[PDB]
Design a protein around this ligand. Structure first.
Ligand code: ADP
Ligand code: ADP
Ligand code: ADP
Ligand code: MG
Ligand code: MG
Ligand code: MG
Lengths: 50, 453, 588, 200, 454, 200
């Protein structure tokens, strides 16, 4: 019964806490990297004109 | 003022030298060597040089056997109240095999900012004919209430439905509709155009139909000509005008394309930094003006990319408009029509639309109980199907039945069913009739003995 | 003509003086070799040109000449069963002239065969009123496809001469005088690739196209003149879908475009198509197919203009009155050309490198497809159905290409990778996918079969969505409590997924199932769920049915492989179900 | 653009009664302190600042409509006279100064609104009054700096904003605070800065 | 026609400017004679009127502008083509290192080559025995295919490359088989490893090597693959041989492409790499296959490394868009001791169906393949159930599958880099592992095949 | 900046002794082999390089402090004479050659410190000695190249680094390794390159 409790509680933790935090973090960093690349590239454009 | 002094051509952009007397945002006309004429506007003027962007691009242009003519005026619109029942394009040109209009006056489509102290606060009620909107998220004359949707979702039907059901309890003829289509497919446009023809809703409306294949600058000029016509009908002719605009996502992409063509540095997620301000120059054109009969009401319809509400286009639109109406796939899957989620959606100025004289006495009271019960009723419905079954203290079980009935009987009305605010309020009580009297604390005992069966 | 002088060569960038009467977006010829190029920008006298072929061995002093027009295709007899490329260069005529299996630089030759004799039979009386789009006569380029010679656009009025005989596409088959002048009419009309061919009016597509693919025709149908997209990862099966739709579509012509594909995959279309016998005619599919082939290492402008040359040729035969279906695979590598070309133009990059006008160029393509009434007093109808297959990097449809595509297409067939393995083909996700034609198609077929087909399709989907809702109930909580009815819905959905949704494109009878077969198959599955839920209440337990319906569910599962001429066997399955659950109802 | 001179600056330790329970109790702001209200759309940034503008125990209120809705400026000029200061028992408009540059009004002019607002607050501060200034919204101001930057072909910093963004803001929030005003009597006034931030 | 100029205007880093020129073309080879007489070679990267931008290969250190001269060769990069190239080692620019006499060339060809007409390219129709069970059986290499190997830094992709080169063959003896081996940005030690292992096994006499080091000029690095393919297209499409091209490392090639890119002051670029990286890889990958009516073929096995081992990197990602399948090397497998560490699940060969079947391989090749792949998939799955529930909870059938997956890794794919298996040895080994399964679990296969093969 | 000529470049066979378990056991480095130590700040790269420099069974060590802390250089000259190892019971200082270029020392001298150290290592390899060259850190060398590339307004490659960063690194390591030195004696010297990388 304690093992069932532990398993069930771990399952609830996996679904509500672990994975959603993981999906949202993989989305934040992914977008952050996509933003800074746009920034640096944009900067490199102006430099090339010089 | 015609010049054959075209110095340079790079992409859609063009440079004209040895010119003087030209201004910023001045509309031009480029007559090509083959006789073809192409319009354009001044992006920048410096010295004798003038930087212009051509609407229809610069393909096939011979710089040396082509001339540029400056019109000495910005992108204007010839307005008249003969525009009612007429189909135009993004630039005000007829699209319905109709006689070209004699303008009473021409108006700069940029318009002017309504003086904040001259502005009158949005008041009185517009009956859209949709229970989820008219009751819980009430639309008000002069309000900015957008519909947030997604691809594959029925925002198309929701658009046409409102446009043909929209009316006021004012009088027979002082209400009009300005339908602006932006960068949408032809099929979507022909659906709109003929649904207006079928229902006869065209007889009280003006249509500006711009397609996805039309040049980007014609796509961004479309809503400005729509609002220009709307402002004319409302402020000069004293009409209550409802403006329907879609798709705002197409607008942003068009604005995105134009920005990069002008070598402008992009902001968040590759969109222009002035995306907010640009959108704000459209939406803030709505409202009531003191001393003037009539008003301008806007319903901007857009698609949320990846259903992401944090996307720039929805997020910035939310930062401008007074609330939103949100469509969800979870409800559309359930067969709900229209699939309106009343929880993340909201109307900020519903305070001015409801109340005796506008709608009946219990409008403000019922929406609170319906919303509160639905919030508790859905989670009851949700927790029941996930955990257990029919074991919800016998109080959440009736909330579960309430939530499901609320979704399938109250919200789901159909795209071709007009629900007057009377029928909506009556239906609301019949849904509240399920529950015991203890649940409706939000409503006073007086109204209950007056409406509750 | 005017020549110019190169003054700068840096990679594909070539600038040249005395390009004074050249125009923007003009195709021109750079260097002694005469490699093709295009005039991107024009600064006063000097023109900057992007060469589309290798620029090695080219420098200042060399001549440059404009062709006098933008990128254009030749529209006339000798175009069918021909394998062009992106810039409409015939690959077979290539091998004859260059005597090589390779492609050299500066070697250019006309698209069609100007030296070839074609018999022309006039259908117009002399002195009759003509306009743009009218038909003066025809050439039987092949059966079935009758090549109709139409009056070129911008030409009107007088018709002084016409006669029938063996002409070529160069010789004047007709002469028409006008205010502009008295010009010779040929069997060929040139047309700009980027710009679409004008029509009288565009209509809304309401007639669904038969693909023989059950998941498409039933749940996510595509009308003739519609627009569909196939996004997915590697091994998803888009190419199979493209081939399947190209094989079995009830369209007069097929335009297959290979934007930028692997050579080893390109040869398959090249060789298999002539070996594919046609519907009831009995010839090769190739004789009703125009092929535009481009490998990955080909010029980037060939890989970019690929879909536009295809849609241009499609418009040409559409204007004749034919229903055309253009196949695009793959568009992700078409857009890869755009990303590359824009980088060389030093433009401001859009999302993830792609041009800011990405969605605009996509829109300009898919909009040129649709049910129309072509020019001419006949007011004849033609149509173009665009089926594109997109290839996101990892199957992520958040790709700029996919996102901009779904803004203009009306049909979406998303291919899950989870369905790719476990061999669920076609791997089209039946939940995420959608059709903006589903409503109208369902009522069209409600008349062609006079059955509640739209009700069956709706119920079929309802079973599937319910399954997903039931699926998470299974996860979060466990398989219990089944409630009999809910666990049955899973079994009916499982039946729909396995016995209907899945079909082998390589199986010799499951590669195609007609509307006749599609209906009976769905009716059998649905009536199984109907009769089981109805007997469940009064009164049977769940695996009692599952024990007595062992062999009958096997027949339903094998209904896919039942021959078309034996269609009655499927109907026999349907009424076997009714007797077997009463067989154990009394007594159970 | 030049802050009004003071004799000395003092650390704010006197709380500002707003009437908002969550604020006054758990997250209070002192008279002379500075508060930032960042949140998504429909969060209540404008409402909060209005609540501060209405019921606060300050002498004057300078409300700055920086690149926001016009209705929200019309809402103030109408309601405020009809409302009574919970202390003085007189109309709210008798103690408030409004500055409005809406989102569709000139972009460059919404930078001036910020500096116009803070200068008026400093002016009444020197009279020995306790003033409070509301910025709605500072994000819009930052956009004006960014757009003006692009026109100047400046080198982009963070998210397109100019490198001196942090400078301009820091200089703005330093113009507020409890001070000993100029004068022989050495009177004390203060400015409490409430700023709404609208992150994407 | 000498075209030598003492005119030298500017030297900015790697680049050098020269005025008063004429007849100078793009990508034209040059030589610079310095004040001390030291001669260095270069290439035109940009030529404008009366001017020319060139990059010196061996650097610009010591070069005095006033006392130096630049001669224009009037020709791009070329290869002295011949059939006598076999048995010899060439460098980046096709120059000998094996201390042997330089070849009298049949003719000279550009290294860019020409694009194969897609209407002239034929089916890839038969097998190439690499000697690798994981490859030859499950991810078959067909003749004329482009099947790359995806690896990473630390993984044994050099032992694999060397193993393929020796063991690769056509099982019809009436077909001259050759191996063009291109080394790109390769360190001397592993460059020597190849050269010595090519001699100790006598693979040189069948192969043509192109060795380019990491410290050698970046233009040579770029030219090396095109030097190898020009040879490959001659030996095959002119001399009728079955050519197998092996290229490594492709990541090193891409880095040099970036180096020349910023030299022309071009702008990045997806994750640093130039926007034309896709075509630039296609221009040398797509140069393979079988041509109609022409004896011989060109088959490529390009090997690259994944930066931090992610398939979303530009080099593996774009390569997958040009090639038909890939062979994936895994660090998990390598750390466990499996050699070669070929992960069969994510690796793929799109053109395997055509190189197999009776007459090419045995009749049971496709059946054993699908069964091994499936059994291993469910075998690996049963293992991760045994770690969560213990072996006690597993059914008796799944325990066998669990034991199957283990031995499938330790025997079937764990050949060893010095263990050559024929296609027959591989197939029969597949049956020994399929015999592990219950008979009731073997009903999937045709009973015709079950009877004839154990 | 020009490598000292050899006669033949060989393959390193003999494993070097660092005295560190994880290195000597699982990730060993041969004499003439090349090793990198990438890691963030505080990882322990410098400590590892000192550890190898103290217990290496090579004849000579060469520690290059490229753009790093001055105390770490001061640390070496202090304790090395006090430590007794490995042969003849003599000081570590009598088998080491230090090249100090601190972070606040001029940028251009960073590249020199690397090229000077490897040349000295090449010099002692020619007399048949096993020498170890320590680079701490090769990132500062690259940072120096990046900083200088910007001042010359060149087009960078990735993260500001010049596009020739790849080739120049390749030059440094290919100057190392076990070789047979020029001459009649045909002695064997070896340059074991223990480099450090400091990834952002
Ligand atoms: N409808 C289908 N029926 C049977 N097999 C299919 C089907 N679709 C795809 N496949 C299988 O999946 C593989 C992928 O084929 P392909 O269309 O080339 O995928 P992609 O186009 O995504 O690369 C094929 O080898 C084929 O065997
Ligand atoms: N303190 C509050 N009490 C009641 N309702 C509030 C409060 N704050 C916000 N709201 C509701 O939330 C909505 C958002 O108001 P607003 O301040 O304009 O949003 P923001 O300024 O964050 O964009 C308002 O329309 C109001 O109905
Ligand atoms: N092998 C080790 N044994 C004991 N302490 C260590 C070891 N490596 C690192 N440390 C501790 O970690 C700190 C980091 O040292 P250092 O090499 O300067 O970091 P890095 O060079 O990676 O920036 C040192 O001050 C030391 O105290
Ligand atoms: Mg494919
Ligand atoms: Mg706000
Ligand atoms: Mg350190």
């Amino acid at each position: 019964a304690e093992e069932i409790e532990k398993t069930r509680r771990r399952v609830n933790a996996l679904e509500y806490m672990t994975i959603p935090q993981l999906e949202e973090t993989i989305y934040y960093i992914k977008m952050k990297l996509e933003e800074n690349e746009r920034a640096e590239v944009t900067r490199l454009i102006k430099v090339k004109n010089m | 003022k015609e010049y054959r002094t075209i110095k340079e051509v790079v992409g859609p952009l063009m440079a004209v030298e040895k010119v003087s007397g030209v201004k910023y945002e001045e509309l031009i006309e480029v007559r090509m060597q083959n006789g073809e004429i192409r319009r354009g506007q001044v992006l920048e003027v410096q010295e004798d040089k003038a930087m212009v962007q051509i609407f229809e691009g610069t393909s096939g242009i011979n710089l040396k056997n082509s001339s540029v003519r400056f019109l000495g005026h910005p992108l204007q619109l010839g307005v008249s109240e003969d525009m009612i029942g007429r189909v135009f394009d993004g630039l005000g040109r007829p699209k319905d095999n109709g006689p070209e209009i004699l303008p009473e006056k021409y108006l700069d489509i940029n318009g002017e900012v309504i003086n904040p102290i001259a502005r009158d606060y949005p008041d009185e009620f517009i009956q859209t004919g949709i229970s989820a909107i008219d009751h819980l998220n009430t639309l008000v004359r002069g309000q900015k209430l957008p519909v947030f949707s997604g691809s594959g979702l029925p925002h198309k039907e929701l658009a046409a439905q409102i446009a043909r059901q929209a009316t006021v309890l004012d009088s027979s003829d002082d209400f009009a509709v300005v339908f602006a289509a932006i960068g949408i497919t032809f099929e979507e446009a022909e659906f709109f155009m003929e649904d207006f023809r079928q229902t006869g809703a065209i007889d009280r409306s003006v249509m500006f139909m711009n397609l996805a294949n039309d040049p980007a600058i014609e796509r961004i000029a479309t809503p400005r000509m729509a609002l220009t016509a709307a402002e004319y009908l409302a402020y000069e002719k004293g009409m209550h005008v409802l403006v329907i605009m879609t798709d705002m996502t197409n607008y942003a992409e068009a604005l995105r394309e134009i920005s990069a063509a002008r070598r402008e540095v992009p902001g968040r997620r590759g969109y222009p930094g002035y995306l907010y301000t640009n959108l704000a120059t459209l939406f803030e054109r709505a409202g009531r003006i003191r001393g003037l009969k009539g008003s301008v009401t806007q319903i901007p319809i857009l698609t949320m990319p990846e259903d992401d509400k944090t996307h720039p286009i929805p997020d910035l639109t939310g930062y401008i408009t007074e609330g939103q109406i949100i469509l969800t796939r979870e409800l559309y899957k359930s067969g709900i029509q229209p699939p309106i989620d009343v929880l993340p959606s909201l109307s900020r100025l519903k305070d001015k639309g409801t109340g005796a004289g506008k709608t009946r006495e219990d409008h403000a009271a019922t929406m609170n109980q319906l919303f509160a019960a639905y919030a508790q009723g859905k989670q009851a419905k949700e927790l029941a199907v996930v955990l257990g079954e029919s074991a919800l203290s016998d109080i959440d079980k009736i909330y579960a039945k309430f939530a499901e009935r609320f979704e399938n009987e109250y919200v789901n009305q159909g795209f071709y069913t007009n629900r007057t605010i009377t029928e909506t309020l009556d239906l609301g009580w019949e849904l509240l009739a399920m529950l015991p009297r203890t649940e409706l604390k939000r409503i006073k005992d007086d109204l209950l003995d007056k409406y509750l069966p | 003509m005017q020549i110019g002088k190169i003054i700068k060569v840096s990679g594909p960038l070539v600038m040249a003086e005395n390009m004074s009467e050249a125009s923007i977006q003009d195709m021109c010829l750079v260097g002694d070799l005469g490699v093709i190029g295009e005039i991107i920008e024009m600064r006063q006298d000097v023109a900057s040109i992007q060469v589309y072929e290798e620029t090695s061995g080219i420098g200042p002093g060399e001549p440059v000449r404009s062709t006098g027009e933008a990128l254009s295709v030749e529209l006339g007899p000798g175009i069918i069963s021909q394998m062009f490329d992106g810039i409409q260069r015939p690959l077979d005529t290539f091998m004859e002239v260059t005597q090589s299996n390779f492609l050299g630089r500066g070697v250019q030759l006309p698209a069609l065969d100007h030296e070839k004799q074609w018999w022309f039979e006039a259908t117009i009386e002399e002195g009759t009123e003509v306009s743009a789009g009218d038909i003066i006569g025809y050439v039987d380029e092949t059966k079935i496809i009758q090549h109709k010679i139409m009056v070129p656009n911008g030409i009107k009025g007088t018709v002084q001469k016409i006669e029938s005989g063996s002409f070529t596409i160069d010789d004047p088959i007709c002469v028409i005088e006008t205010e502009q002048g008295l010009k010779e009419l040929t069997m060929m009309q040139k047309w700009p690739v980027r710009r679409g061919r004008p029509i009288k009016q565009k209509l809304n597509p309401d007639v669904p196209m038969i693909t023989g693919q059950r998941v498409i025709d039933t749940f996510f149908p595509v009308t003739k003149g519609g627009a569909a997209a196939v996004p997915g990862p590697f091994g998803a099966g888009k190419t199979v879908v493209q081939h399947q739709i190209a094989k079995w579509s009830d369209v007069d012509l097929v335009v297959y475009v290979g934007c930028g594909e692997r050579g080893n995959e390109m040869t398959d279309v090249v060789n298999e198509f002539p070996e594919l016998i046609d519907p009831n005619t009995g010839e090769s599919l190739m004789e009703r197919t125009v092929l535009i082939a481009n490998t990955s290492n080909m010029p980037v402008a060939a890989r970019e203009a690929s879909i536009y040359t295809g849609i241009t040729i499609a418009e040409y035969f559409r204007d004749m009155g034919y229903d055309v279906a253009i196949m695009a695979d793959s568009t992700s590598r078409w857009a890869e050309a755009l990303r590359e070309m824009s980088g060389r133009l030093e433009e401001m990059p859009g999302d993830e490198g792609y041009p800011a006008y990405l969605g605009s160029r996509l829109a300009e393509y898919y909009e040129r497809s649709g049910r129309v009434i072509a020019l001419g007093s006949d007011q004849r109808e033609g149509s173009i159905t665009a089926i594109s297959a997109v290839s996101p990097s990892g199957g992520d449809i958040s790709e700029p290409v996919t996102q901009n595509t779904l803004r203009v297409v009306k049909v979406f067939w998303g291919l899950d990778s989870s369905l790719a393995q476990k061999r669920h083909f076609p791997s089209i996700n039946w939940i995420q996918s959608y059709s903006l034609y589903s409503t109208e198609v369902g009522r069209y077929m409600d008349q062609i079969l006079q059955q509640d087909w739209s009700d069956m399709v709706t119920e079929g989907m309802r079973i599937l969505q319910e399954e997903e809702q039931l699926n998470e109930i299974v996860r979060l909580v466990g398989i219990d409590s089944l409630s009999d009815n809910d666990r049955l819905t899973l079994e009916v959905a499982k039946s729909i997924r396995e016995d209907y949704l899945q079909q082998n494109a390589f199986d010799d009878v499951d590669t195609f199932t007609s509307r006749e077969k599609q209906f009976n198959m769905l009716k059998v599955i649905l009536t199984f769920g109907k009769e089981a839920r109805k007997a469940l209440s009064l009164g049977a337990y769940f695996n009692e049915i599952m024990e007595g319906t062992v062999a009958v569910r096997e027949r339903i599962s094998r209904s896919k492989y039942i021959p078309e001429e034996e269609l009655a066997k499927i109907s026999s399955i349907n009424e076997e179900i009714k007797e077997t659950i009463q067989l154990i109802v009394s007594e159970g």
